[PDB]
Amino acid sequence: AAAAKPNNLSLVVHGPGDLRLENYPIPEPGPNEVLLRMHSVGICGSDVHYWEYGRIGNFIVKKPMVLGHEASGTVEKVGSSVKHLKPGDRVAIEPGAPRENDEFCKMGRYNLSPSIFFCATPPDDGNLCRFYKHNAAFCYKLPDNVTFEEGALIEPLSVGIHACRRGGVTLGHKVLVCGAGPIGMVTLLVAKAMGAAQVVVTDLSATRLSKAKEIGADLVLQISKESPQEIARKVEGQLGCKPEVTIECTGAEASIQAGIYATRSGGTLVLVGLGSEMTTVPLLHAAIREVDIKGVFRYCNTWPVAISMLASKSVNVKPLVTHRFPLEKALEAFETFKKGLGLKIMLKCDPSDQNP
Amino acid sequence: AAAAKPNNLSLVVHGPGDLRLENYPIPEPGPNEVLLRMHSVGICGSDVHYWEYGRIGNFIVKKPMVLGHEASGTVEKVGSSVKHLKPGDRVAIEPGAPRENDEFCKMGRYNLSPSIFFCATPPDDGNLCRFYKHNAAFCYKLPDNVTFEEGALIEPLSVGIHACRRGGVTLGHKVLVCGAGPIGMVTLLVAKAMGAAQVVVTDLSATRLSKAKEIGADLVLQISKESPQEIARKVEGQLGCKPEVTIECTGAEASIQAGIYATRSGGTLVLVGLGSEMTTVPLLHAAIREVDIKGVFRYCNTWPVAISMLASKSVNVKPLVTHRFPLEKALEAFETFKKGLGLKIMLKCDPSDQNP
Amino acid sequence: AAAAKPNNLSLVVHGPGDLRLENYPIPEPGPNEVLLRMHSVGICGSDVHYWEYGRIGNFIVKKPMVLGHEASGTVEKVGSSVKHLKPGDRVAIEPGAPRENDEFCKMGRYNLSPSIFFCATPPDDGNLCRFYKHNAAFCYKLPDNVTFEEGALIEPLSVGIHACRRGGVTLGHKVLVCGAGPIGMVTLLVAKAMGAAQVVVTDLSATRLSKAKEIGADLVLQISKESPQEIARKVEGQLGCKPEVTIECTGAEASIQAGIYATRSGGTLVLVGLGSEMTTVPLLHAAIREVDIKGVFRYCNTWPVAISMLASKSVNVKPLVTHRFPLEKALEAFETFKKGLGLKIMLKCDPSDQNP
Amino acid sequence: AAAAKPNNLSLVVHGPGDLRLENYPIPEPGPNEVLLRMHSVGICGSDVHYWEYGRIGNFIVKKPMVLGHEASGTVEKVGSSVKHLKPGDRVAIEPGAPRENDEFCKMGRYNLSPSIFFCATPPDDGNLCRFYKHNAAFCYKLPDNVTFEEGALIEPLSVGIHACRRGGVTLGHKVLVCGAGPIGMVTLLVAKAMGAAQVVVTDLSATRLSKAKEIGADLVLQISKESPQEIARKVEGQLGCKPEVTIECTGAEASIQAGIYATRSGGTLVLVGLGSEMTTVPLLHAAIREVDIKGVFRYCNTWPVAISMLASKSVNVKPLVTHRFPLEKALEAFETFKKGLGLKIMLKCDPSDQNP
């Protein structure tokens, strides 16, 4: 008998509350793609949401979908046209890869390309598996002093990078970050690395705020039932001035309203968090003071920068990882996520290397 | 006896529905001010609103206020430190003059200075009178080939310039202007002057839309009872694509919702029109497609540019003027404004020259 | 015998002074390419330079190269993955097509991609022939009201668009354009379409300046042996102020120096013209007044915009065409170019349609 | 007899090599000015240059001039219109104060105002004295946790802030700083504070480079006799790539040429150092790769930001101070500056407090 073939065990959502570990064929990379032996994949609230609800808005899992999109791995094989990567290279994977060079890609905002492929957003399969192929231009080599888990953390970190760029965060700024979930946390980390003088973070949880303090938050405000105007007043009271930039990472209407009231005239309110289809806000208050309201849709052009910041030790994302489980314990990892305790949970897909 | 002294008949609002023509003292210019013999003043919907309701939001006329803020005149006398203007100079008056060199002024956005002086916004008296003093830095000399009425039209034109700049309007753009009132009209003129390929204008009035066509609108859409989504669809149908920039000049919630649905991903929705304190909108739809929502608060750094466009005959605002009355017929002029027919009404304050 | 096959007569430079018309195989388009039946190709000074010198700087014709890069044509056949174009479509061809999605392409500046393919820049063959294949993302459909020659003129026009964008040209600006060759001319056209109040053009030739006046130049200055400071003084004397932007389209050292002296503090000097490897300039004078010096390397993201401006009749490039010859008379067309008389010369490659 | 009056001993340059300590009248603050009891003043190479040559370019000391412009002090008396400062307030002094609200001030670039007042640039007297009056808008209150010497260091630090802003320095950048003098050093500090991943510093002095390493330089290169191309090659070798931004702080032609060869295409070369009136450089090499060449003229809008970074301990400039002398030992201090050893020398003007 011939040698045993490798496997491609994958974490798949078939529908609401129907999560399974099953084997998939091993992908064959096209001329401009690379086949990766997956190593580390972080669990994102969105992967969990598809498992629980089978959809997010109008993005419905109509056929079984492999989960996972915050990842790193090792190049196993490269397509005939690939020259910048070779077998053995450790790489961080940027999940959104444009399918066509449309005007959004040409202008530098490929994240807005309508036909973009994106790991684990139906109907595109994610990378929580053993072997996964991806466009080579979107796999970036990791320096030796950057771990696989840091490589996987580049994905959420990039949301923070894109959000801060969209907000115009820069040297000396006072920034308000609403929400201390992983997104608010990486946003806090990025704001500080960019030179923000003070970053204030809000959240409903004292525990999450305590963690925010540990990683750099200068000020924190625990939210209970105060009004948006009251929160704005308290923030200003802590800073001694209004923040030039507010990055909204909760998606809650009251928080968006608070951001409008809190932001300094001429400043910027960045909307990262996802809320309802309709929202009631004091638009006039923002517009009349030229507080711009800018949304974020994932990110673009953040991997090389994230990699440089990690390699130079300019930012430390490691404290964000609270648990790590082998791929086979994915169900337990997802139930742990649901318990709300902990922060970033890593799934280790390579049996030969379960280390960070 | 001694020669008769000059008079300073002024148009004053004492409270809701209480408008009066009354004499004021002749102002004396400080070292950095000029005394102006007022010539032409355009009537703005806001002047009319203070007359009708005695307020706009929390800006209430608590003591009698002189109306008027879109104006031009002749330098009568200059303060000791004034060197760029001399008696006899014809000037356009920029109504917002900072009282202190705060951070907003230093950063180039003096329109956002909290303590700014602004003609006819309580408690600052306007310039619908015979003689008016103003900071010399904000009185701009008019070229001989630019009329007093064009000088007065620089004020509303500047709202259009500031809005197009804030919207990023540039060469080849498809622009949607919501509203065909004077503000939407100057926005249309500026958009075309800046190189917009196509400008679509919407409005409830077929008459105002016909006027829009006469001055440059490439496409017009009369709004009746369609929904925001339907209007957005019609606009895209007419343009063959989504406009990259939408400039909202109505302040109506339905129109703002239409702007969000109509604007191309990555584009900009500029809010000029004033609506209610609270607005219900598909915020998510804009944010998730990175459609920026930017407000406008009057303008900054637009007078020299407006003067250059008028002097070079690059834009024609003359068609906007539909009526002219001497200052003494201000009541008749305001009642005419209320009738709704016509567009820009000019008040002529200098008995020695009632021409354009 | 079978039907006669089509031909692909091409204009080829073998070396200095060695220009030939010869037949080439008919290209077969890949999945993402289209085969075009060439229609109109404008002659650029660079095509002429390769013919005369066999090189430009270190770009040497080491093997026979087909000339031509300012063109339009008709889609003859499309590759299996092409969906936005179909046989029969009239298209304008953007000559620079990136070979890889490197960081320059991802950031929106694909013109700087090191491995970019560019028609008629050795070793890449141009499009002065019957049939030519090209990446489909870089062939843009022309509206029915835009001619093939206007389609070909988009290439040089795009240099002007890119130059004006890099210069920050906008509403009300006073702009100085050095040089009245086709590049200075399209730059003048673009500056005016963008809202420049006044555009001053300089050149050694009175005839070229007369043409500049015909198409929109507000002021012109004929250059003889004046010093750079003297030219700067004269320009300022004509404008009554220093121009905010200067676009250098000659490549002559004295002109670059004049641009530094002429540009308003805080303004921008754009370098389009190609000069020597080393240049002596009053760098200090520019730096100390924050006059930025920005270069241009062809263009990026200009075709859709150029097409919208032509379709809306916002710019008229037709007057730039002074002669048109069928492909077979290319030698005569190039000798005519050398005579320096005339401006844009068009070569007509489609025997079935020799019209504009 | 009456109590002794205060004195205003000042350090004055009368001509080349003619420096004197002499008494001046006590200034009287106008309505919008404050009288300051000077505390700490850093010595700048320019103050020293006026002493040695009696001029810098065409800025010549035609009448005796008080030196000094990098300073902090205590508010002694305030003008009648001053409300944000009171006697006793510790303040950092921004030396450039516009005399008129011209277009440069209105647009947010007051540093370019032609008639600006600037301490110690003839004919404007500096602040190396006991009592000095200054426009109140340009005296900024220091937080209690920020020292007088840090307040004085805000001046050179601001050159670094303005240079990094002009260079577009941001998160993850690889930056080349040419020159390890105090200007290159503050530029290094700011670059790192803004998120630069790696900053390479060059200089002729190994001692200055050792100091650079101590405060944050990731890489250093001592320059001996290599050519500009060779240095550019070494820099790229060390970084493993070309720096996106180069900040030239030497003014040397060879260094500027090296910056052009070293900077990544699409990047920026910022010119801070002052060189000769004419410079020979590979302009083409920069222009054709769209490497922008941007100059710096001191700074604008940097004091509040600098104060926020110092107050938040985001940057440490203290290591820059190597010597301190009372005002009376100014001659000794200037001779020490000329010796070349050491970096920033502080002059202490307040006999009642000689501490940092």
Ligand SMILES: NC(=O)c1ccc[n+]([C@@H]2O[C@H](COP(=O)([O-])OP(=O)(O)OC[C@H]3O[C@@H](n4cnc5c(N)ncnc54)[C@H](O)[C@@H]3O)[C@@H](O)[C@H]2O)c1
């Ligand atoms: N637009 C994008 O491209 C993009 C990419 C990533 C994530 N997101 C979204 O960003 C949001 C943040 O995600 P995450 O993973 O950090 O989520 P999360 O659920 O872990 O964190 C959200 C936090 O908001 C806090 N919160 C809720 N209401 C609040 C209020 N009124 N005031 C203050 N704090 C409040 C919660 O206690 C929680 O800690 C989500 O809505 C996510 O879907 C958007």
Ligand SMILES: NC(=O)c1ccc[n+]([C@@H]2O[C@H](COP(=O)([O-])OP(=O)(O)OC[C@H]3O[C@@H](n4cnc5c(N)ncnc54)[C@H](O)[C@@H]3O)[C@@H](O)[C@H]2O)c1
């Ligand atoms: N933010 C600022 O700095 C600033 C400065 C000037 C004016 N404004 C505001 O801009 C707005 C426009 O002012 P104006 O003088 O042109 O006003 P206007 O009343 O003359 O014109 C408004 C136009 O909107 C049209 N309209 C109303 N609802 C509509 C809808 N749902 N769909 C389409 N069209 C609709 C009306 O028929 C009318 O022609 C006002 O709210 C004004 O107060 C703001």
Ligand SMILES: NC(=O)c1ccc[n+]([C@@H]2O[C@H](COP(=O)([O-])OP(=O)(O)OC[C@H]3O[C@@H](n4cnc5c(N)ncnc54)[C@H](O)[C@@H]3O)[C@@H](O)[C@H]2O)c1
């Ligand atoms: N960087 C790029 O991407 C790019 C793209 C297109 C063209 N170019 C270059 O731009 C330049 C313009 O090309 P073109 O086709 O219009 O060239 P051209 O030769 O037709 O025109 C150049 C003009 O400059 C004039 N001139 C020469 N010296 C002058 C001086 N001292 N003062 C004033 N006028 C002077 C000439 O009389 C002539 O009319 C060329 O150097 C070309 O190679 C650069």
Ligand SMILES: NC(=O)c1ccc[n+]([C@@H]2O[C@H](COP(=O)([O-])OP(=O)(O)OC[C@H]3O[C@@H](n4cnc5c(N)ncnc54)[C@H](O)[C@@H]3O)[C@@H](O)[C@H]2O)c1
């Ligand atoms: N434009 C402005 O607004 C502004 C404001 C401040 C200072 N400056 C200028 O910036 C420059 C730096 O000033 P500073 O106080 O730090 O000066 P400095 O003299 O103390 O430092 C200059 C450094 O350059 C080094 N150097 C000289 N030639 C070199 C070369 N070829 N390669 C590498 N290193 C070289 C010297 O060894 C020295 O350490 C000066 O020219 C100063 O006048 C400009």
Ligand SMILES: CN(C)S(=O)(=O)N1CCN(c2ccnc(CO)n2)CC1
């Ligand atoms: C369902 N989506 C496709 S969406 O367009 O409503 N939008 C949901 C929120 N988004 C999220 C959430 C979590 N992680 C990411 C990217 O890692 N994006 C960004 C995408």
Ligand SMILES: CN(C)S(=O)(=O)N1CCN(c2ccnc(CO)n2)CC1
């Ligand atoms: C009451 N105002 C002070 S306000 O801040 O609600 N806002 C109202 C709308 N604004 C208007 C309306 C008409 N004309 C102008 C300026 O000419 N501004 C701009 C100002």
Ligand SMILES: CN(C)S(=O)(=O)N1CCN(c2ccnc(CO)n2)CC1
């Ligand atoms: C030889 N070249 C490759 S180059 O890099 O020296 N540079 C030369 C001048 N350039 C020109 C000249 C004419 N037409 C074009 C583009 O149509 N580019 C831009 C390109």
Ligand SMILES: CN(C)S(=O)(=O)N1CCN(c2ccnc(CO)n2)CC1
């Ligand atoms: C003589 N000057 C007025 S100048 O315009 O040649 N230029 C010289 C260099 N400059 C310097 C040098 C040192 N310190 C400063 C500002 O603190 N500016 C900036 C000013």
Ligand SMILES: [Zn+2]
């Ligand atoms: Zn995610």
Ligand SMILES: [Zn+2]
């Ligand atoms: Zn108004």
Ligand SMILES: [Zn+2]
């Ligand atoms: Zn060309």
Ligand SMILES: [Zn+2]
């Ligand atoms: Zn200095």
